Write a protein that binds this ligand. Structure first.
Ligand SMILES: CC(C)CCCc1nc(-c2ccc(C(=O)NCCC(F)(F)F)cc2)cs1
Ligand SMILES: CC(C)CCCc1nc(-c2ccc(C(=O)NCCC(F)(F)F)cc2)cs1
Lengths: 190, 190
């Protein structure tokens, strides 16, 4: 029934914002009553937090999997496989992505979740840049953590604008190539 | 008295969010009554829209001024002078920047203002990249408008995270050099 509430919420978020979804809407979709809903989640806000937590951990575990089983390809394709984790994971859950980013403004728990994982993904990015510099493949230009931070924030803004069809945005079918170019040139360029 | 209302609002936004500022707060600061406030602005939301409109046009007119009077320096310093318009203009009005970005979620007029100017700044960016390619200084890699869009969105997210001291963020004293590196490598890199 927890899974039914979560699937109901993800389905309804494709049609309307969390503000237009009632606890009664979530309960009906999961085949339970309102007070029975409160046995599983304290609020509709907690439901979105759990949905975002699932998608964020999905992306994180995919990047951990790549990290353990390196692809046998050139540096451009290495970075492309990493960015693609986020493109495919968040782009496969557009309504949770959209609603979760909007909740950053109003939910300390959402803001803290997003902050925690971005710090982790930025640290990992910087560690890989540092490894590329140590082996002589990348030049020692900017501080690696500072470069990693700007590239990770570029991807957050640019992928999510693309998925939402914002004006302006890179077309979704061009956004991966766009970001790979900017990561590879900025990491390997003198 | 319009200028007094606007100065009052900019001052109060340094201490608290627009949600915690009342029309009565703005009126008191400008030395007028509540109904007299409504003679100048329909809402506190319109006051923020005007503040954001002023800062956005300040940045736009600064970039127009640079465009007319080119600086006599290398390509890295050219791009640095352009990014610096946004760093100095928005970084000199941090409370309006913060409040204006937050209002994008709730105000169609704010969202449309921000969208309109980003389109203009992206078009100008793409026109300069195209000129650099035409003269043989930049290689024909990505579509220039797509590259321009991702670089402009990177700057929006990265400058505003820096000004807000978000975790994560590039330190404010490093953010200009960080962005200049990524623009120059991605625009001139093969
Ligand atoms: C083959 C193995 C060793 C992977 C090596 C390539 C790597 N890629 C990354 C990386 C991290 C973050 C993001 C990124 O997109 N952040 C932003 C996340 C989001 F959601 F905000 F967009 C994109 C790539 C780090 S190392
Ligand atoms: C010497 C003359 C000819 C200027 C040539 C250098 C140029 N610089 C730009 C440019 C445009 C936008 C931004 C930019 O930061 N956008 C994002 C704005 C904001 F506010 F969202 F951060 C940054 C530089 C375009 S051509």
């Amino acid at each position: 029934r927890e899974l039914a509430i979560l699937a109901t919420a993800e389905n309804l978020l494709e049609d309307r914002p969390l503000a237009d979804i009632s606890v009664d809407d979530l309960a009906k979709g999961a085949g339970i009553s309102r007070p029975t809903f409160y046995f599983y989640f304290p609020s509709k806000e907690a439901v979105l937090l759990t949905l975002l937590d699932r998608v964020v951990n999905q992306a994180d575990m995919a990047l951990q999997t790549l990290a353990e089983n390196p692809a046998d390809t050139d540096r451009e394709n290495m970075w492309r496989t990493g960015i693609n984790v986020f493109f495919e994971t968040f782009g496969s859950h557009k309504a949770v992505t959209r609603a979760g980013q909007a909740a950053r403004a109003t939910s300390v728990e959402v803001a803290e979740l997003w902050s925690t994982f971005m710090q982790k993904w930025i640290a990992y990015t910087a560690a890989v840049i540092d490894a590329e510099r140590d082996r002589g493949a990348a030049p020692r230009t900017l501080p690696a953590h500072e470069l990693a931070t700007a590239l990770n924030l570029m991807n957050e803004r640019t992928l999510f604008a693309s998925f939402a069809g914002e004006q302006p945005s890179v077309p979704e079918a061009r956004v991966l190539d766009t970001l790979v170019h900017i990561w590879v040139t900025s990491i390997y360029g003198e």
